[PDB]
Design an enzyme around this catalytic site. Structure first.
Site, PDB file in Angstrom:
ATOM      1  N   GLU A 135       2.179  68.732  66.671  1.00  0.00           N
ATOM      2  CA  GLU A 135       2.995  67.393  66.825  1.00  0.00           C
ATOM      3  C   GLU A 135       4.294  67.867  66.402  1.00  0.00           C
ATOM      4  O   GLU A 135       5.226  66.916  65.827  1.00  0.00           O
ATOM      5  CB  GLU A 135       2.340  66.177  66.295  1.00  0.00           C
ATOM      6  CG  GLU A 135       1.225  65.811  66.773  1.00  0.00           C
ATOM      7  CD  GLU A 135       0.438  64.645  66.115  1.00  0.00           C
ATOM      8  OE1 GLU A 135       1.266  63.981  65.240  1.00  0.00           O
ATOM      9  OE2 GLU A 135      -0.719  64.024  66.461  1.00  0.00           O
TER      10      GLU A 135
ATOM     11  N   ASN B 221      -0.876  72.339  69.467  1.00  0.00           N
ATOM     12  CA  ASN B 221      -1.424  71.138  69.670  1.00  0.00           C
ATOM     13  C   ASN B 221      -0.408  69.950  69.656  1.00  0.00           C
ATOM     14  O   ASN B 221       0.470  69.783  68.672  1.00  0.00           O
ATOM     15  CB  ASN B 221      -2.740  71.026  68.587  1.00  0.00           C
ATOM     16  CG  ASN B 221      -3.628  69.753  69.096  1.00  0.00           C
ATOM     17  OD1 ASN B 221      -4.177  69.866  70.256  1.00  0.00           O
ATOM     18  ND2 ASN B 221      -3.926  68.888  68.013  1.00  0.00           N
TER      19      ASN B 221
ATOM     20  N   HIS C   7      -4.536  61.430  74.001  1.00  0.00           N
ATOM     21  CA  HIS C   7      -4.841  59.813  73.460  1.00  0.00           C
ATOM     22  C   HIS C   7      -4.186  59.420  74.576  1.00  0.00           C
ATOM     23  O   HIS C   7      -3.157  58.981  74.599  1.00  0.00           O
ATOM     24  CB  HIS C   7      -4.127  59.796  72.071  1.00  0.00           C
ATOM     25  CG  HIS C   7      -4.674  60.363  70.891  1.00  0.00           C
ATOM     26  ND1 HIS C   7      -6.009  59.586  70.640  1.00  0.00           N
ATOM     27  CD2 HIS C   7      -4.724  61.422  70.263  1.00  0.00           C
ATOM     28  CE1 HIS C   7      -6.385  60.479  69.682  1.00  0.00           C
ATOM     29  NE2 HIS C   7      -5.667  61.506  69.265  1.00  0.00           N
TER      30      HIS C   7
ATOM     31  N   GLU D 267      -8.453  65.907  71.232  1.00  0.00           N
ATOM     32  CA  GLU D 267      -8.727  64.554  70.591  1.00  0.00           C
ATOM     33  C   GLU D 267      -8.893  63.457  71.869  1.00  0.00           C
ATOM     34  O   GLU D 267      -8.363  62.425  71.569  1.00  0.00           O
ATOM     35  CB  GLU D 267      -7.632  64.124  69.677  1.00  0.00           C
ATOM     36  CG  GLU D 267      -7.168  65.256  68.691  1.00  0.00           C
ATOM     37  CD  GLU D 267      -6.117  64.849  67.725  1.00  0.00           C
ATOM     38  OE1 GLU D 267      -5.684  63.914  67.504  1.00  0.00           O
ATOM     39  OE2 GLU D 267      -5.518  65.946  67.185  1.00  0.00           O
TER      40      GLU D 267
ATOM     41  N   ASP E 244      -9.436  60.389  74.211  1.00  0.00           N
ATOM     42  CA  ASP E 244      -9.955  59.042  74.037  1.00  0.00           C
ATOM     43  C   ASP E 244      -8.910  58.176  74.828  1.00  0.00           C
ATOM     44  O   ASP E 244      -7.864  58.435  75.196  1.00  0.00           O
ATOM     45  CB  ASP E 244      -9.822  58.643  72.399  1.00  0.00           C
ATOM     46  CG  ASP E 244     -10.058  57.038  72.022  1.00  0.00           C
ATOM     47  OD1 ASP E 244      -9.167  56.392  71.545  1.00  0.00           O
ATOM     48  OD2 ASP E 244     -11.289  57.083  72.368  1.00  0.00           O
TER      49      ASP E 244
HETATM   50 CL   LIG Z   1      -1.817  64.998  76.035  1.00  0.00          CL
END
Ligand SMILES: [Cl-]
Ligand SMILES: [Mg+2]
Ligand SMILES: [Mg+2]
Length: 304
Positions: free
Chosen positions: A137, A191, A233, A261, A263
């Site tokens: 990030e 990531n 996400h 991750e 979702d």
């Molecule tokens: Cl993404």
């Protein structure tokens, strides 16, 4: 609820993963974890605040219990995360001034802490992981000038202490550990989330391409950054065409891609429970069809 064991369905395509806590390693949770997944990510136990809460007090006990149990139960381990702005203790990159304000450290002291953390934690777990998220990030959302990746980086505590080269310096430090331990097969990942935003993906692509092209030219064509992780996400208004365009853009760097991750939640806008469930199920189906179509370049798909 999966109606067939997922790791069996996708065994020829990519590892299937889940993020866990210690509760997941007991009881019916452990049986579900084992039946469906080849690989796990620690939800919180391997973050900087969990591993080095104050300067030189490394706290590996709980993380070692988790990773030893995962391996004893026949699963692999993805390492999350060496360098992040969240869940990261202040002492790494700030100090208190004479009036008790928090201010940045200087570049040399902050690099020293960055390298020591990466290199101590990597050497402690060694080849018990298959990969590390080295940096998470780092990029602003919806950057307006993605052709300039350094101007598009978030002004996080590491950026304010070290400067715009800190992502490169993190990966150089992690790659030196692997050069010194050549038998470890561990992939180094960058990531991030919102990578379906095309500007943000262009910025990430430009960062990896710059870092890897300079490193490969000096190292007989060997890349520095091995992987790009798409956090996934997503929500029911995510456009799967934008996910495909970014997936393909990252594949064109010559790196592996993982979904780290995944979702799917409701949008901005009020939905209503049946419409929400239909939207979630339809996106998941479209995303797995895209991932299967690109499986030669996808190593792992892990759920949140
Ligand atoms: Cl993404
Ligand atoms: Mg694959
Ligand atoms: Mg070795």
């Amino acid at each position: 609820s999966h109606m067939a064991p997922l790791k069996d369905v996708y065994k020829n395509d990519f590892l299937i993963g889940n993020a866990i806590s210690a509760e997941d390693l007991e009881g019916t949770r452990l049986e579900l974890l084992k039946m469906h997944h080849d690989v796990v990510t620690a939800g919180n136990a391997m973050k900087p605040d969990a591993l080095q809460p104050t300067k030189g007090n490394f706290t590996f006990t709980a993380a070692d219990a988790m990773i030893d149990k995962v391996l004893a139960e026949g699963m692999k381990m993805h390492g999350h995360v060496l360098v992040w702005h969240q869940q990261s203790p202040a002492w790494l990159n700030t100090k208190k001034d004479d009036n008790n304000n928090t201010v940045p450290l200087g570049r040399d002291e902050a690099l020293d802490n960055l390298r020591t953390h990466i290199q101590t934690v990597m050497k402690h777990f060694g080849n018990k992981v298959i990969s590390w998220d080295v940096v998470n990030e780092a990029m602003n959302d919806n950057p307006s000038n993605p052709a300039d990746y350094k101007a598009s980086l978030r002004q996080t505590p590491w950026y304010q202490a070290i400067g715009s080269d800190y992502v490169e310096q993190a990966f150089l430090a992690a790659r030196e550990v692997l050069d010194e331990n050549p038998s470890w097969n561990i992939k180094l990942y960058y990531n991030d989330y919102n990578e379906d935003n095309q500007n943000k993906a262009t910025a990430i692509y430009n960062m990896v391409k710059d870092i890897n092209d300079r490193y490969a030219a000096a190292h007989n064509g060997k890349l520095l950054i091995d992987g790009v992780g798409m956090q996934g996400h997503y929500n029911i208004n995510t456009n799967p065409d934008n996910v495909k365009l970014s997936l393909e853009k990252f594949i064109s760097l010559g790196v592996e891609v993982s979904v780290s991750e995944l979702d799917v939640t409701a949008g901005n806008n009020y939905t209503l429970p049946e419409n929400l469930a239909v939207g979630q199920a339809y996106l998941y189906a479209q995303l797995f069809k895209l991932y299967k179509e690109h499986a030669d370049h996808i190593a792992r798909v892990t759920f949140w």
